[PDB]
Structure formats: C-alpha cells, structure tokens
C-alpha cells in the first residue's frame, strides 16, 4: 500500500479484491491497467494523486485502488475488462457503475465526490445512531 514513491494506490488481487471491497461498506474505485499500455502509464500518476485528493475529500469514504488485468482474470472476466485503463466503481448494496471520461485526477476526483455524498454524510452535525440500529 504505502511505500516508495506513489500516492495512495491500493493493490488488490482476484481474491482479496472481494475481501477488501465486499468486506467493506465504503466506495472502492477499482482501476485496471496494463504494464504494457501507454494510455495507462499516463494515468499511473493521475490515479495516485486522485486517490489522495479523493480520500482526503471523502475522509476515506471513497478509496481508490488499482488492479492488473494481466494477472486478474476472475474479476476481469466477471465484468469483462479488455480495454484498459478501466475505471469501475462499487457500492455495497447497489450494482457497480462504469466510469468513462476524463482520465485525470481532476476528473477522477470530481466524480468520487458526486458519490461521497450519496454514501458518506454531508458536512453537517448529525446523530450517529443507537448501536447502528
């Protein structure tokens, strides 16, 4: 996760991916890239930065991760990832969506926010809840 020179990009596998996302009630932005593709190499940094700008803006609610469609087949096949980069969003409870647009932290982040509100509560005092139920 956090090491060397890189933003807050989390590496998930074809097995843990479900144990990290499904096992969490938070938005997980799964992005599939190829180590032999340019369109991705240019996003490498764009995603790293965005992750931080998104995690800080979403207070951790909306996290950003990356996957290697070259090693991940279970997932890639599940939805069918052949055209990288491939940004996909997953929200515990409702079906996941397909992100298609600007490939720059500027845009990537802009979206994450549009969701943050959906799940995570807005900036305004509010009761927590009696034992979450």
UniProtKB/Swiss-Prot annotation:
Residues 8-127 form the Thioredoxin domain. The chain holds residues 161 to 280 of 440 of the full protein. The gene is PDIA6. It comes from Homo sapiens (Human). Expressed in platelets (at protein level). The active site is at 37 (nucleophile), 40 (nucleophile). This is Protein disulfide-isomerase A6. The record marks 38-39 as: Contributes to redox potential value. Disulfide bonds join 37-40. It comes from the Eukaryota.
């Amino acid at each position: 996760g956090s090491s060397g020179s890189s933003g807050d990009v989390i590496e998930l596998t074809d097995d843990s991916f479900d144990k990290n996302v499904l096992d969490s009630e938070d938005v997980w932005m799964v992005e599939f890239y190829a180590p032999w593709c340019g369109h991705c190499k240019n996003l490498e940094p764009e995603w790293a930065a965005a992750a931080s700008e998104v995690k800080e803006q979403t207070k951790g609610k909306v996290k950003l991760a990356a996957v290697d469609a070259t090693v991940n087949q279970v997932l890639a096949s599940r939805y069918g990832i052949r055209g990288f980069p491939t940004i996909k969003i997953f929200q515990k409870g409702e079906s996941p969506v397909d992100y298609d647009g600007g490939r720059t932290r500027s845009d990537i982040v802009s979206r994450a926010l549009d969701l943050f509100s959906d799940n995570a509560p807005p900036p305004e005092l509010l009761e927590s809840g009696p034992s979450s139920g």
